[PDB]
Design an enzyme around this catalytic site. Structure first.
Site, PDB file in Angstrom:
ATOM      1  N   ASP A 214     -18.955  59.881  28.488  1.00  7.40           N
ATOM      2  CA  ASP A 214     -17.795  59.161  29.004  1.00  7.40           C
ATOM      3  C   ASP A 214     -16.497  59.782  28.520  1.00  7.40           C
ATOM      4  OD1 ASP A 214     -19.256  57.196  30.442  1.00  7.40           O
ATOM      5  OD2 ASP A 214     -19.566  56.073  28.580  1.00  7.40           O
TER       6      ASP A 214
ATOM      7  N   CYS B 289     -18.142  65.130  41.781  1.00  3.71           N
ATOM      8  CA  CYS B 289     -18.034  64.128  40.731  1.00  3.71           C
ATOM      9  C   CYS B 289     -17.281  62.926  41.298  1.00  3.71           C
ATOM     10  CB  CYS B 289     -17.369  64.721  39.458  1.00  3.71           C
ATOM     11  SG  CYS B 289     -15.804  65.623  39.657  1.00  3.71           S
ATOM     12  N   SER B 290     -16.125  62.602  40.715  1.00  5.05           N
ATOM     13  CA  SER B 290     -15.221  61.550  41.163  1.00  5.05           C
ATOM     14  C   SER B 290     -14.139  62.116  42.067  1.00  5.05           C
ATOM     15  CB  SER B 290     -14.558  60.842  39.967  1.00  5.05           C
ATOM     16  OG  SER B 290     -13.843  61.771  39.154  1.00  5.05           O
ATOM     17  N   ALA B 291     -13.185  62.835  41.482  1.00  3.07           N
ATOM     18  CA  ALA B 291     -12.183  63.533  42.275  1.00  3.07           C
ATOM     19  C   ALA B 291     -12.675  64.896  42.734  1.00  3.07           C
ATOM     20  CB  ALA B 291     -10.883  63.698  41.480  1.00  3.07           C
ATOM     21  N   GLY B 292     -13.768  65.400  42.156  1.00  2.00           N
ATOM     22  CA  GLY B 292     -14.312  66.672  42.605  1.00  2.00           C
ATOM     23  C   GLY B 292     -13.545  67.910  42.180  1.00  2.00           C
ATOM     24  N   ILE B 293     -12.858  67.867  41.030  1.00  2.00           N
ATOM     25  CA  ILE B 293     -12.151  69.055  40.560  1.00  2.00           C
ATOM     26  C   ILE B 293     -12.447  69.345  39.090  1.00  2.00           C
ATOM     27  CG2 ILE B 293     -10.369  68.860  42.307  1.00  2.00           C
ATOM     28  CD1 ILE B 293      -8.555  67.392  40.306  1.00  2.00           C
ATOM     29  N   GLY B 294     -12.630  68.318  38.271  1.00  2.00           N
ATOM     30  CA  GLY B 294     -12.798  68.573  36.850  1.00  2.00           C
ATOM     31  C   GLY B 294     -14.207  68.939  36.455  1.00  2.00           C
TER      32      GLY B 294
ATOM     33  N   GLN C  28     -10.308  70.990  34.695  1.00  2.00           N
ATOM     34  CA  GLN C  28      -9.157  70.162  34.404  1.00  2.00           C
ATOM     35  C   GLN C  28      -8.603  70.372  32.998  1.00  2.00           C
ATOM     36  OE1 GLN C  28      -7.273  67.364  36.194  1.00  2.00           O
ATOM     37  NE2 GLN C  28      -7.655  69.166  37.491  1.00  2.00           N
TER      38      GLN C  28
END
Ligand SMILES: CC1(N)CCN(c2cnc3nc(Sc4cccc(Cl)c4Cl)ccc3n2)CC1
EC number: 3.1.3.48
Length: 493
Positions: free
Chosen positions: A393, A427-432, A474
């Site tokens: 997390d 993932c979530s935003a797909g960048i980190g 990120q």
């Protein structure tokens, strides 16, 4: 990206804005209280406001504002959307005037302490025609040297003295520059000419990040010694103003609610275009990423984009999906469940998915899915969903072993499938997290087929992937983890 100041404090930012800025002037800086975060410092009515920017791994989170893929896209947004940045009280903060940093430490070409002959050996070994660097002078304290290679005997290294006089820099005559960066930028456009005629063209900085794979452990040790990792990462971040490519399609009214985060958008020139929709049906927040395999980097599905997600997978002939988030992390939704329960069958618009079988490992769950178009049984193909579950997390995994063994399995699945399309990663935003997995996979694939006799260049690889989707990778902790994953992979050969 002159408005980012990497080595200043809050007090120093206040004084800089109050003495050298006006109302509307701004800078950004790393947060000294909360490492890994950043602060936007803005002058307004003779007072300085400090606005916190968090990045826990998924996006830049401007307190009291929106989420962004890079600091540059954040600054671009507010400088072009006036009255969009509101304060505590809800009053407008105008970003009007970047306050330029003079510090060269985050420039690719600045080496600091470096002898004239050390620079010659570096330029001899890895330099090309027009490769250059700037170093401190070893005879005149406070002065610098610009070392350039032009071209046995056909190539040479020329050293140009740069004197510092009253915090202004010059090459002995002509113009006096407010920073080394201005000087370099000027003589890049207006190259110096030698008395005998040779043009000292400043074509590109000397590469210092490409190393041989066998040298990774030594390089990691060096970077581990304000550490080298932070300096290298921030230098990479300084290159992000080169990547402000257009994202017009994602800003269209009809596509706004297809984005998990309204300002984290796919570049128009690499976005996946969905082709035979219901008679705007061509949009999904996703980009093609090309390094042998290619990738699609995308966000976690929203309820209203699950159908479009399966159209993408179908149209692109993807046979492997890599999910790097739980559905829910810290009580927040990061991806809706876009697959059926084990043994169940669902229709997502015109696409039909059967969950054939799930297999659990400690780090991940594998879901064998059968995807087909409704009304056409001849279109069926198996899509293997690798759902990574143990990403922490906070931060990055302490050991890369689980991520590496996961990607090794994903790679072999993909390689075993004839003519499979790009691997989908989200993932979530797909960048980190998504960028971190994809970059590691790209680097590991070079070593897998070349062993130790190959060059690897982590920041170059990241910059190349950042040119195909905003903000891929990120954080500094992810940057470090990429190095740690590559080192561990080379050692287990
Ligand atoms: C001390 C320093 N001031 C900072 C650390 N150290 C460097 C030097 N070049 C760096 N370069 C990058 S990004 C990049 C890398 C390869 C090829 C290409 Cl094309 C790009 Cl854009 C990212 C970090 C860096 N870091 C040497 C100079």
């Amino acid at each position: 990206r002159r408005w980012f100041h990497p080595n200043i404090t809050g007090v120093e930012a206040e004084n800089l804005l109050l003495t050298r800025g006006v109302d509307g002037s701004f800078l950004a800086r790393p947060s000294k209280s909360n490492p890994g975060d950043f602060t936007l410092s803005v002058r307004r009515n003779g007072a300085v406001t400090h606005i916190k920017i968090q990045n826990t791994g998924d996006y830049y989170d401007l307190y009291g504002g929106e989420k962004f893929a890079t600091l540059a896209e954040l600054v671009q947004y507010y400088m072009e959307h006036h009255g969009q940045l509101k304060e505590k009280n809800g009053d407008v903060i105008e970003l009007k005037y970047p306050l330029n940093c003079a510090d060269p430490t985050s420039e690719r070409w600045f080496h600091g302490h470096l002898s004239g002959k050390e620079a010659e050996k570096l330029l001899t070994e890895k330099g090309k025609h027009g490769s250059f660097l700037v170093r401190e002078s070893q005879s005149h304290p406070g002065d610098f040297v610009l070392s350039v290679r032009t071209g046995d005997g056909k190539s040479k290294v020329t050293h140009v003295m740069i004197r510092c006089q009253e915090l202004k820099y010059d090459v002995g005559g002509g113009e006096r520059f407010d920073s080394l960066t201005d000087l370099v930028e000027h003589y890049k456009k207006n190259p110096m000419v030698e008395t005998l005629g040779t043009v000292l063209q400043l074509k590109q900085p000397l590469n210092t990040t490409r190393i041989n794979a066998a040298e990774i452990e030594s390089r990691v040790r060096e970077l581990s010694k304000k550490q080298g990792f932070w300096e290298e990462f921030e230098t990479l971040q300084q290159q992000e103003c080169k990547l402000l490519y257009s994202r017009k399609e994602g800003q269209r009214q009809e596509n706004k609610n297809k984005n998990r985060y309204k300002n984290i958008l796919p570049f128009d020139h690499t976005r996946v275009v969905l082709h035979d929709g219901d008679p705007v049906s061509d949009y999904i927040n996703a980009n093609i990423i090309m390094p042998k395999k290619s990738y699609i980097a995308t966000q976690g599905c929203l309820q209203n984009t699950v159908n479009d997600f399966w159209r993408m997978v179908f149209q692109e002939n993807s046979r492997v999906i890599v999910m790097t988030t739980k559905e829910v992390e810290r009580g927040k939704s990061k991806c809706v469940k876009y697959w059926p329960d084990e043994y169940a069958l669902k229709e997502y618009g015109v696409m039909r998915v059967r969950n054939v079988k799930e297999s659990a490992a400690h780090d991940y769950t594998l879901r064998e899915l059968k995807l087909s178009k409704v009304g056409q049984g001849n279109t069926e193909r198996t899509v293997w969903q690798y759902h990574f579950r143990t990403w922490p997390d906070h931060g990055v995994p302490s050991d890369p072993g689980g991520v590496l063994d996961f990607l090794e399995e994903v790679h072999h699945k993909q390689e075993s499938i004839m003519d499979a399309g790009p691997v989908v990663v989200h993932c979530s935003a797909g960048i980190g997290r998504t960028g971190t997995f994809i970059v590691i996979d790209i680097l590991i694939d070079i070593i897998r087929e070349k062993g130790v006799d190959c060059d690897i260049d982590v920041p170059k690889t990241i910059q190349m992937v950042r040119s195909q989707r905003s903000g891929m990778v990120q954080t500094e902790a992810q940057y470090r983890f990429i190095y740690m994953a590559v080192q561990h992979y080379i050692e287990t050969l």
